[PDB]
Amino acid sequence: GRVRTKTVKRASKALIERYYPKLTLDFQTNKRLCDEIATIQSKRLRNKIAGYTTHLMKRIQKGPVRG
Amino acid sequence: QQQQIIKIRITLTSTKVKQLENVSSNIVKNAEQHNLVKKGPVRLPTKVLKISTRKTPNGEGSKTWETYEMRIHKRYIDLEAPVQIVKRITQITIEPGVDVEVVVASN
Amino acid sequence: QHAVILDQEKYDRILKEVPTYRYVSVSVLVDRLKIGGSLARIALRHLEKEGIIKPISKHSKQAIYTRAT
Amino acid sequence: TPVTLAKVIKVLGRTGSRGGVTQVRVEFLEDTSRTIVRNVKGPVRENDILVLMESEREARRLR
Amino acid sequence: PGVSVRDVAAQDFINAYASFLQRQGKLEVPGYVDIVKTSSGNEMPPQDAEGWFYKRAASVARHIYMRKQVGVGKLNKLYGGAKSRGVRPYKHIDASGSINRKVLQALEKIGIVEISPKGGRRISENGQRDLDRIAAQTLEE
Amino acid sequence: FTPVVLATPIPEEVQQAQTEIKLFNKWSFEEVEVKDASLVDYVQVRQPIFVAHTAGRYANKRFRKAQCPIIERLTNSLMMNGRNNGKKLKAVRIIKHTLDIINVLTDQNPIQVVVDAITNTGPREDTTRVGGGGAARRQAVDVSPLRRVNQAIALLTIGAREAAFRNIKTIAETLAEELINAAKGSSTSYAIKKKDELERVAKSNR
Amino acid sequence: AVPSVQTFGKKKSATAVAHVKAGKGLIKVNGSPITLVEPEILRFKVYEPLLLVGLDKFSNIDIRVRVTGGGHVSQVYAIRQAIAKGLVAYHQKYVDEQSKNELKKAFTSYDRTLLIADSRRPEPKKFGGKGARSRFQKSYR
Amino acid sequence: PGTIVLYAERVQDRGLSAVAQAESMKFKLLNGLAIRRAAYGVVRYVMESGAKGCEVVVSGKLRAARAKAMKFADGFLIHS
């Protein structure tokens, strides 16, 4: 039951594409930088975005990603 | 009437902690800038009022039980100053929803 | 069904048989003798102050007793 | 009667009408390379070890 | 070798001290004892006869020493239990007020419990003399 | 080894427990190896514990109760049937009495005896009512080693409960009667017969 | 001047504060010693912090303990917890970490609840049933 | 007397006042004006006052004995 809404996924995909040099493979820095490069109305929602983004980009280190 | 310490105690309760925090932080900072001897704010255990009631105006339906709440925060702030200096900043700018209770201590 | 008082034809059986019992309880005495519960209850109370068997555990409602030596 | 041991390898899936039964693929630690599937009731994991009375019977209730 | 009433189990502490009161023989029982059940939650009176008042006194005597000031109401609550109220469910029923008050009054005559102007009844200077002496007894045999 | 002088004088019987992590004060946790295969890794050994009563978070997952200690496992299965739901203090004292009684006889390791008993009385082959209806057939199924142990622990308890119900007997000795009967193997106890009934029905409808 | 620590230990409703500081090997819990905790079957349930690390690590410390809240066995879990953390926090600040560390690995390997509170918390009941998840017995007839 | 006083003032941005619209819906219908006509009138003004969305629900029998309830909506409405 960990399937995320499109709001988490779309924001995570949009964020990483235009900010890949800014992001880093660590979640603690990713959630910290997200507070200034995006406006999120809840820390729980912001963590879900940063939790998926640090999950998407480990797979970026493993070959390509479609989309 | 020349710097007569009176042991003045102010008690504040409300229902909106957002509005209550505005008033409490003002008297506290007012005494801080007037370098009083200040007993910092003490927040009482926020009392909660419960009324459970059946949703149905009739008796027909599944046994559903709603319950409403009121939240009663409470603070008491004690100040140490002459009567004249503190009465000018207490009679005015009282934000609504905060019933002010100023009392005098004789301890 | 079961005896209720103590007499010599029942007392000598108690003395001659209780040694070499590995385990003695209120019910075991009621099973292996004609004594009742309280008669069994004064059994484990009495014969230990004669020291014939050794106490390992002491608890109300439950006899935990072992033959001495 | 020669009771024999068996050791689970793959939990092939859950079966039975009510979901109780399981089909697991077991192996024999004595007289190895004999692999048979069995219809098992309780919870089970990988590398699990169990006991079988007989080896001359496959697991039937599949799919 | 300092021994207060803290270093003996409360089971054999009361048994010794009630037996200390047994040989003392001047506890001033009120005379209507050995017949009352001491609680509506109790359906038959206390089984012991010769020393149950000594049991009640000694158990209570610990309570004032443990606590600060205790009226009859606290001791009334403490020793009451659950009442079989019949075909209806159980409920805590307060115990008897006549005995435990007189138990306090009886122990007042000994010189153990004061009048405690800050509440109910409190310990005395002579209150813990026998207590700590019996406590000194109960640890070392 | 040598006595240590503390301002709180701790009794000698309890202070010696540090030299070997035993049970309460008397019984050990060594040589508890299981004579019967397929039940090792599914009965808790080599986790020394001081008590049969713990606040054990063991049901939140699928197999956390597999690591639940077996002397706690039997206490929890005992504390049931309406008038004994809850009250684990009743369960821990009953086994405290039962472990005393069981070592009164048969001087060997008490945990080894119940380990022998749980191996002996575990439903070895169970039936399954294949087909979704009353007019159906039973089919014999090899039982899981956990399910063998988990069910049979209740078979020790349900036998002693029947023995202790409306009888002169008490539950501690009847339990200590039920563990010694299962460990030996007699078909005299309740648990072995109920295990045997499941086997005899199973062989008929393989 | 005198070195001391003070740690807490909480359960479903119980709590316990213990002050670990230099002494001569004293344990005291509400006045009565650790040997006099209640009941007799749960006496030993608090000795594991002593038994795992040894009385040899208690030579030069005295322990004062208070416990409140919850129910009878819940305090015993709370008493054994704040005692365990009290020693660990004491040996951290004034002794080398390995003494604290050896305590930590020993306690965690046996029972993690000595240094960690049990996060299992009660679930409130819901209308339509006396339990948190249990429901009223409907009929359909 | 004198311990209670009144200051009457005017609500700004009237189109965002759900209560104030309700009587203007009530007053238009009490004259004889068409229920469809008034409900379209109120939502257009509310929407043009900067609102993200407005929903107007009239319920009750209308020109037929068997009562029917109909809605009138615009913009974005959320419910949870």
Added chain:
Amino acid sequence: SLVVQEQGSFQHILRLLNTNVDGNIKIVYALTTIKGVGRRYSNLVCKKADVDLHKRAGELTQEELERIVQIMQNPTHYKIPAWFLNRQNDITDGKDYHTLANNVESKLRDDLERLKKIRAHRGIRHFWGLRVRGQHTKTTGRRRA
């Protein structure tokens, strides 16, 4: 507080006011077999007679038995504050009585007989076999009582 052993100077079951007291049981709960006497009324009078509670009503003496029967018919003369008897403040004389075993029915029938005579709602309920204490009989106590 001491424990004393016992010896079998026994006598078996005997009658007691036409109510055969059951033997082999403790005296207080043996006197519960006496009608109109409960666990309370047996415990107190046995303590009055100075008898040990652990006599088991089998190794007793006739001298103690003739003492307690006097306490049976005449209880107020053995230090009771008279709130402890079976029939408090009776109708016939205003005196507190303790009707003994055999005749509880006689004062029970006479009580209903008076209620039958007075033609009160209670007495009419008794003759009809209904519930007198206001208990509902619509769907409870249907076939019996």
Added chain:
RNA sequence: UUAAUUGCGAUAACGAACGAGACCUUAACCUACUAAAUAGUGGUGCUAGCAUUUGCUGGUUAUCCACUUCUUAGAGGGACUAUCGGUUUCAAGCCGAUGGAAGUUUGAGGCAAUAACAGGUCUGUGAUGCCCUUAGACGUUCUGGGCCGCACGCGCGCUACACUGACGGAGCCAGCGAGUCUAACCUUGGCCGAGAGGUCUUGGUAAUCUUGUGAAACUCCGUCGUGCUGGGGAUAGAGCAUUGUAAUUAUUGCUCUUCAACGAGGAAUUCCUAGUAAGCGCAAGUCAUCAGCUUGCGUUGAUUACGUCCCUGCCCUUUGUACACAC
């Protein structure tokens, strides 16, 4: 695959909205900020007690110092499944170890879409249309009864049938609430009485007083020993008090005593997956008193499975229809 039309994917659809989620409240942590005599702690200005050579406790905060560890509430920090391993079309995800206060949507609720029901409510309303009644009233009030009447059938409940026990003495720990000057509310303590209870004083408009609601279950020791027995208190006669103007149809509480079925319950059937089921009581609602009821709160705390369509219900797709007021 998910709890989810939740997502990945395939793809004549693409881009969206509502709903789900997100959100909010509440429980779980913080030796890091703010503090506190309406909370607690340690020392001690001032002292006090004993067993003693130092442990606990009466205490005092311009009749002392310091602080938030615990209690509290403001600001935050914290979890997003985190790292790794396994597996999947190597995607969405699921399993396990470890670390962590916490890894079942973190636990639970509040809200919750379109369309609908001839569902229920005219007995909440001075929300309301039509009909009826309107002076001998279906309007309003007073007295008494009835709603509780009792051959019977059915539903929700409490007490049990005993030793995993009852009884007696002892040990003896909670949390959520409520409480009167807009007057007789929560009540402490003293006195008297077996008890219920009576009387006098006392604190509290309430983190202060009831209150630490010293609840019960539970724990220690003794009485009972399988006997419808001391399990069971139904039923019934007496007396004693309280609330009420009134307790009779027993309002209820207390004491003696009377002492039934009930020996685990046919067909059939109810709810429930971890601080959960169950046991146990407590607080509030109603209320002058009456709970066997409900809503919450705490105490003790199981068994069993991480699955399926076998029954039951619902939903979807295909298909048939002479149904559409829709079997």
